[PDB]
Write a protein that binds this ligand. Sequence first.
Ligand SMILES: Cc1cc2nc3c(=O)[nH]c(=O)nc-3n(C[C@H](O)[C@H](O)[C@H](O)COP(=O)(O)OP(=O)(O)OC[C@H]3O[C@@H](n4cnc5c(N)ncnc54)[C@H](O)[C@@H]3O)c2cc1C
Ligand SMILES: Cc1cc2nc3c(=O)[nH]c(=O)nc-3n(C[C@H](O)[C@H](O)[C@H](O)COP(=O)(O)OP(=O)(O)OC[C@H]3O[C@@H](n4cnc5c(N)ncnc54)[C@H](O)[C@@H]3O)c2cc1C
Ligand SMILES: Nc1c(S(=O)(=O)O)cc(Nc2ccc(Nc3nc(Cl)nc(Nc4ccccc4S(=O)(=O)O)n3)c(S(=O)(=O)O)c2)c2c1C(=O)c1ccccc1C2=O
Ligand SMILES: Nc1c(S(=O)(=O)O)cc(Nc2ccc(Nc3nc(Cl)nc(Nc4ccccc4S(=O)(=O)O)n3)c(S(=O)(=O)O)c2)c2c1C(=O)c1ccccc1C2=O
Lengths: 270, 271
Amino acid sequence: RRALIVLAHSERTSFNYAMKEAAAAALKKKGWEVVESDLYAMNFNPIISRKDITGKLKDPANFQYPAESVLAYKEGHLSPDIVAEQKKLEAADLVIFQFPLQWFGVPAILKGWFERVFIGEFAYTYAAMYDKGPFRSKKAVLSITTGGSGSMYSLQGIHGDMNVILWPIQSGILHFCGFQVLESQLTYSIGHTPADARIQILEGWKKRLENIWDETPLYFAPSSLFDLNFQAGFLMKKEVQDEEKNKKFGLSVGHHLGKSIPTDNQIKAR
Amino acid sequence: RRALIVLAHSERTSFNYAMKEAAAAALKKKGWEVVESDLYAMNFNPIISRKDITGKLKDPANFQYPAESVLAYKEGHLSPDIVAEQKKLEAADLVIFQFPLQWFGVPAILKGWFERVFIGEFAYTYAAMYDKGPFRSKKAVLSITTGGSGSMYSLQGIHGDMNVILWPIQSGILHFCGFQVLESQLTYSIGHTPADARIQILEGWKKRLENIWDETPLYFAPSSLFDLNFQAGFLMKKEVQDEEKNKKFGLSVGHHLGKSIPTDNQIKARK
Ligand SMILES: Cc1cc2nc3c(=O)[nH]c(=O)nc-3n(C[C@H](O)[C@H](O)[C@H](O)COP(=O)(O)OP(=O)(O)OC[C@H]3O[C@@H](n4cnc5c(N)ncnc54)[C@H](O)[C@@H]3O)c2cc1C
Ligand SMILES: Cc1cc2nc3c(=O)[nH]c(=O)nc-3n(C[C@H](O)[C@H](O)[C@H](O)COP(=O)(O)OP(=O)(O)OC[C@H]3O[C@@H](n4cnc5c(N)ncnc54)[C@H](O)[C@@H]3O)c2cc1C
Ligand SMILES: Nc1c(S(=O)(=O)O)cc(Nc2ccc(Nc3nc(Cl)nc(Nc4ccccc4S(=O)(=O)O)n3)c(S(=O)(=O)O)c2)c2c1C(=O)c1ccccc1C2=O
Ligand SMILES: Nc1c(S(=O)(=O)O)cc(Nc2ccc(Nc3nc(Cl)nc(Nc4ccccc4S(=O)(=O)O)n3)c(S(=O)(=O)O)c2)c2c1C(=O)c1ccccc1C2=O
């Protein structure tokens, strides 16, 4: 069992670093082979460019990134820092994303990590996406710390449902490539947590990773219910559309179908 | 009136760049003072660090960006790039974010732009946020070109409702700082769009800009319905919670209240 920890924070004194290192000690004691990826420490470049391709470009005039990136992968002409990361992606059974919440999403350095590493054919394919994604036998977690409390991200909060915020990350990025997303570890208002309570959070996180691989993941609508061709528009099957019309709740946050959204569908397991 | 355009594409030969240039010339046509912000061309730094503070750090031992960046702004110890961008904001009346949809969100360079430019005390404040935000006089628009199609992001699409994908950007980032978000300009299935069809998209976009200041912005639950208190935990007033009990719809995407979401809340204007 091998695991990969990705950390997007610039400081060592950060609670994210402490939250990272805690995961390491907890998993290593369980017999895990853990590798890390402090994005800031590596001086990782999150900005995609034509230099991501180390081979002869197919069209140096009109450059299209999703075209040259797929070709380079099949020929081994991606940037050496991207290939290095991809080797860790496949070798790792569990992937942990540790970061502070930043403007209702991941930090730029992490967003750019996704963009450069999740290259077509490697991470995803339209002939094998979501349920059939390359990373099927793999589980992903989100370990986030926010400045705001949990009430502010409640259904009756000022910012809105936190479930909505985590959707374009856990669904469209993680699950899209086959990943099984587990229940996110949410840390609301960490800047306002008493000293001896912070110490407890580290323990609840370390105890969790003792039996995390046997957890029940979040629910997504399986693609077995979609047409999955380019002429139908990848829409849902009418056999199912007529079935889901008698229900009160939608399938998921993005697959709500103009009706009620399942409580904590993106934070709590089904 | 002044307009700011923030372009996020590495390629000059991209349709996003065409969409930027066409938007520029259309505004200058109507006597707009147009300022541009080509991130890739500006070699903009998208990563936050203590390097963002040129002065002396309050605590180089235990460094915290949010609490340390607010200080530099107050005293004027911010990086020249950040300040040069913060001035373009304040000056302009209309902000346009031109970018390709990348992984169900914005490019890192644009995300980093938000992270370094939008600093506390300037862009936002716990007392002055959303409806009472600092940028409550200004308007913002999203101009997006996606790979997938409109049906893929339809309600029954494999990807899901675009309104959900657009919410954390428009509500959590734009509106949070006071902005008035207009109807996003979505260009689906680009690359599968014919040449003569791509020349018409530009003109229609240039036409919309003619009377875009007189458009209706997207709906967001007014902060008046909430108790802006920490003892109340910034929740909806019980007076308001008892009003929205006999209803079968929420107020927005993030304020669905476990109920239904108003159709096209993040793409189509109110009513
Ligand atoms: C650009 C930007 C955008 C942001 N956007 C958002 C947003 O949209 N929403 C939002 O809610 N927040 C936002 N934030 C705030 C951000 O979420 C918080 O700053 C972050 O979650 C906490 O930072 P940190 O995890 O590095 O911990 P720090 O703030 O560095 O540390 C928190 C506390 O943990 C303590 N600590 C450190 N190490 C240990 C240890 N080993 N044991 C015990 N205690 C320890 C420290 O004493 C410190 O007081 C944003 C911040 C930035 C910079
Ligand atoms: C890292 C990454 C993540 C992505 N994530 C997503 C995602 O989550 N969802 C999604 O849907 N898509 C995604 N995409 C795909 C992305 O949305 C498209 O590649 C992008 O929208 C293409 O837009 P462009 O500005 O590059 O235009 P281009 O694709 O460069 O332009 C297309 C065509 O327009 C023509 N053209 C250019 N200028 C003009 C002009 N002035 N007049 C007429 N024709 C012109 C060009 O000749 C070209 O053939 C992603 C891509 C990347 C690289
Ligand atoms: N850095 C923070 C922080 S912090 O904890 O690190 O200071 C916190 C933080 N949210 C956040 C901000 C303030 C407070 N609380 C807060 N704030 C002030 Cl200025 N005064 C008081 N005192 C106060 C005043 C009157 C009544 C009661 C009280 S109380 O102390 O008992 O809560 N409380 C609380 S809470 O946990 O106490 O509810 C969360 C944020 C951020 C952000 O950086 C940020 C960035 C972008 C968007 C949003 C945020 C953001 O929200
Ligand atoms: N880069 C691409 C590209 S590429 O053009 O740049 O090579 C292309 C591309 N896909 C992509 C690009 C163009 C179309 N356009 C396309 N094609 C056909 Cl055969 N028919 C129609 N008709 C059509 C026209 C308008 C509206 C709806 C429809 S409908 O077919 O969905 O009913 N449109 C269609 S389709 O789903 O509608 O078939 C997918 C994607 C991506 C992505 O990067 C990407 C990333 C994450 C998730 C998804 C994608 C992605 O889908």
